[PDB]
Design a binder for this molecule. Structure first.
Ligand SMILES: O=C(O)[C@H]1O[C@@H](O)[C@H](O)[C@@H](O)[C@H]1O
Ligand SMILES: O=C(O)[C@H]1O[C@@H](O)[C@H](O)[C@@H](O)[C@H]1O
Ligand SMILES: [Cl-]
Ligand SMILES: [Cl-]
Lengths: 584, 584
């Protein structure tokens, strides 16, 4: 079912709360135990949610008497038992709901990692693959006024074909990780819409409205009152209409993040949105936001709440993380290795932070495998579609650290085309790697990126920090350069000499030398050092230092600033001063 | 590396204790994170057991500072965090050993589930696939006098090609589940031997001795002093010699379990064994022990200590389980779906219990895959080799509840042949299923088995207990019949009506009706009901009743007898009087 645009501003019934759950490692409730075939495909299935009729009946499950779990949130941080659980878990709740007239009822999931199978009243309504991207199912025909069984199975088992697959550098947080809600919409409804400036013609707002449901030929209006902008017309059999409409509109900037109130209407459906308007482009080496030359003073960030040691999901998380970005004097954030919860780009639109958004194409994805390609494709489609009206987002990242194979090159070129054909307003990137005295990027996919993005750990994985000053970068003169990652591990309040690895002083030294090395590159235009805050990864098993944390944060797991924070902040204060500009 | 016979009686240095450990879900320590290839085949590898030399070096592990774990034991029962852990884990210890003269040093593992990779001083010494069968590696050339690093990786992740694979009805207990020890033997050592009554002429003892090492041509003696036997011979260049010694010998019977002290001696190597001498055979429908017709008053049993909720492993565990089998008036135990620890058959030798021993070819094994075959084969070979000198053991079981396909049938027939070529002296069987008024066993593999064993759950999975009496079994008049499983679930001290499922009264009633059904079958010569004591299974998810336990125990998880126990015992008291034999 296509993603409903801007469910963020529709009226919802949250299903959040305490649900029933069963841990099911051998998939006893999903699969025939003898032939491994899902029950879906042919009492026993846990999704029928039966109880006994008579005292001599046998049912080896009972959601009514099962343990409870909080929704939303990762299961891992909810019990020591679930910390390392990689596998399948049944969530069950009940709700009453009477649909008005001939409206449609959707269930909308902000995210759930990794495979989700959803059942209403013992009837399958949908499946989703991808751990971080939203999804919704029309459940209209399968509900009843009282006592609805809602069964959602989430499976986070690592599998060859999944994106990501066997290893990443972050914790496998399983379960329903973001809000779950019912959404009631008219028999015909606004399904999708793009309302952004034309990259070929910034005088015009260019986009479309896509209707869905019972009768798709109806009247559609887009109203931007404060701009005196109006468009209205008829839809045809397709429910789709394109428009190129001109806009005295005040443009969106970090320092001045103007959001226009927008009204989207079709038949009986009314929908309000907050949309900022701006152009992002390349002019040789320069990055131009609305014709003005900018520098991206950025930081990398995982979707994690380190005080909770679990998945971030809320507007409160979004405020705390962005308040830290602002103490660091950032105008930009590189978000995780996956789509974060929609509060991030929504709050970034309001506060004036530019964004980079990424799908988990990470390391050894099975590039030759149609199935893997299909999962990477639906995650990117879902991500670009969700956020294509967000002024804050200026980069879609398609891959991070991928092998230089023919298999791989075609995969990334195909993903580029999928992103471009939905949205052509933003930069297409991929976080790449270098090649070694002097540093080149011969990556053929570097021809295909609007902003040349590289990861590099010269002070940390390759040589000690004195190597940074010895190094000369060799780069195309006609394209912005961007460092999508550099940094170093340090345990907060572990102090010593600057050559003692894992001390704050070593990380401080590394950032100093790293900033001196990058300041020599004339085409440098931004960086998202790794990372703003320590985050969980099961690849980081040094006792006392790591204990399952990646320690490359500028901020500790407790929320305490390390010495390196002040090195980067001071450089960013300097870059703010240099690229300081006057708004029209 | 061939299994050392009768290490049970050889002098060993136990490596049991507290070991260092790291949980490693993404196999960070074992495989390259980019291409997934094991470091083994090409600092990073956890098995190099490195520490930093200077303070600027980087090593993202340190076993010296890592958390500690009890060896032996399953990991799941040692911490709530490990209960559902399915994956790889690193165990690490250190040891000093001076080998005397030109002797060899073996490390011996009673079991580790599922895949063990073993390293000494950063050198790979061996791999083992199979979760319940012992294995030993020659480490002579790789140890030093002091401060040896011993690194033991164990992975219990469920995989398609493994035996067992995706699901069973018992808990995936990972780790070093039995004693680990060092066994020093001379440069020429007794590797293997068989010593059993000649089935075809019980006046004689038949067998072979297999020597291994530097000089294979030497004197070999076998003394059985009490029996007046002082056999002596020489070996050829192969070290393998066959023999036919007359017997004066008091034969082994459950009611009189006579074991002989045996000394096997070759060059400087000397081994004591305790061996019982008996014949087991079939005459049409009759089971003949030393030519006396017997009945197998049995119970099924998993290798689990219910008080610990963890894996059974010790002589103390054996004493408890078999104490309970003796209270039930058993002369027979069906051991689980895997080889139990070697204390079971050795104590079964001492106390006079006969035993069925099994490999986990169980449900949907990948019967077309040669890898899966190889892994079933190596477990079968190991089991038969370990226990072929135990009088208690009379059945090798090759399968439990496997699908009637052509691949499975060839798979089981190959297994039977492999078993026969090592040991032809015991019954070959498998747990088969009925077909349904009248009950037949059309399984083509029924023709291949010395004892026809059927699992059936008529009063429980198929019908209510009243069905037992309505049903008529049609079986060969030719071959002894065996009920390898029947039973029902019941929560200890949950009481009510005999038609209230999960009560003790329902179980009592099912046992009464089931016993009345089987007493009618003239070819019936034994049964091992499912099961002696409640055991853990993640397939059993019924809150209040199950809570992760299979509840078909005749004994509760706390060790309390349910009513159904007193029914089987009274039936076994009857069968004891009806099959009364006088030993000559
Ligand atoms: O080395 C590092 O610290 C980082 O490199 C990145 O590519 C990866 O996304 C991170 O999660 C982390 O592994
Ligand atoms: O249904 C039952 O109780 C039993 O069936 C057996 O074949 C299986 O091996 C047992 O572990 C148990 O599941
Ligand atoms: Cl780190
Ligand atoms: Cl049960």
């Amino acid at each position: 079912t296509p993603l409903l645009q801007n469910v963020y501003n529709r009226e919802s019934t949250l299903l959040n709360g305490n649900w029933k759950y069963v841990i099911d490692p051998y998939e006893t409730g999903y699969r025939n135990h003898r032939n491994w075939i899902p029950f879906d495909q042919m009492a026993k299935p846990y999704y029928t949610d039966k109880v006994i009729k008579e005292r001599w009946d046998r049912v080896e499950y009972n959601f009514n008497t099962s343990a409870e779990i909080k929704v939303p949130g990762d299961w891992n941080s909810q019990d020591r038992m679930l910390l390392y659980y990689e596998g399948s878990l049944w969530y069950r709740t009940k709700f009453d709901y009477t649909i008005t007239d001939n409206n449609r009822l959707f269930i909308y999931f902000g995210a759930a990692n990794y495979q989700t199978d959803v059942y209403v009243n013992g009837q399958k309504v949908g499946q989703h693959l991808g751990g971080f991207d939203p999804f919704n199912f029309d459940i209209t025909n399968v509900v009843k006024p009282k006592d609805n069984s809602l069964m959602v199975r989430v499976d986070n088992r690592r599998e060859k074909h999944r994106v990501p697959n066997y290893t990443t550098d972050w914790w496998n947080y399983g379960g329903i990780t973001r809000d779950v809600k019912l959404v009631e919409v008219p028999s015909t409804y606004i399904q999708d819409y793009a309302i952004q400036l034309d990259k070929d013609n910034p005088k015009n707002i260019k986009g479309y409205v896509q209707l869905a449901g019972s009768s798709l030929e109806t009247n559609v209006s887009i109203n931007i009152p404060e701009a005196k902008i109006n468009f209205s017309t008829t839809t045809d059999r397709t429910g789709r209409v394109h428009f190129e409409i001109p806009a005295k509109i005040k443009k969106w900037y970090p320092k001045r993040p103007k959001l226009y109130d927008v009204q989207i209407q079709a038949g009986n459906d009314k929908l309000e949105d907050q949309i900022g308007l701006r152009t992002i482009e390349t002019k040789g080496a320069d990055i131009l936001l609305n014709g003005q030359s900018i520098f991206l003073r950025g930081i990398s960030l995982h979707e994690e709440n380190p005080i909770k040691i679990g998945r971030a999901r809320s507007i409160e998380d979004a405020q705390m993380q962005m308040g830290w970005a602002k103490e660091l004097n950032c105008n930009f954030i590189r978000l995780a290795h996956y789509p974060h919860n929609e509060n991030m780009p929504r709050l970034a639109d309001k506060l004036g932070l530019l964004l980079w958004e990424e799908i988990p194409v990470y390391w050894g994805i099975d590039y030759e495998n149609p199935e893997a390609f299909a999962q990477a494709k639906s995650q990117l489609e879902t991500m670009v579609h969700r956020d294509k009206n967000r002024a804050s987002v200026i980069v879609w990242s398609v891959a991070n650290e991928t092998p230089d194979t023919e298999s791989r090159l075609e995969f990334l070129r195909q993903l580029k085309k999928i992103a471009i054909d939905i949205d052509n307003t933003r930069f297409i990137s991929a976080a790449l790697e270098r090649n070694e005295d002097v540093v080149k990027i011969p990556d053929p996919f570097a021809e295909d990126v609007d902003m040349l993005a590289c990861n590099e750990y010269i002070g940390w994985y390759s040589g000690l920090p004195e190597k940074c000053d010895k190094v000369t970068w060799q780069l195309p003169e006609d394209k912005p350069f961007f460092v999508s990652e550099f940094g170093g591990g340090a345990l907060y309040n572990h102090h010593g000499d600057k050559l003692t690895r894992w001390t704050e002083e070593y990380q401080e030294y590394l950032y100093q030398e790293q900033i001196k090395m990058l300041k020599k590159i004339p085409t440098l235009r931004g960086m998202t050092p790794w990372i703003l805050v320590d985050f969980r990864s099961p690849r980081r098993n040094l006792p006392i230092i790591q204990d399952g944390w990646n320690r490359k944060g500028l901020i500790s797991d407790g929320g305490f600033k390390k010495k390196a924070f002040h090195v980067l902040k001071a450089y960013y204060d300097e870059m703010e001063k240099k690229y300081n500009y006057q708004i029209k």
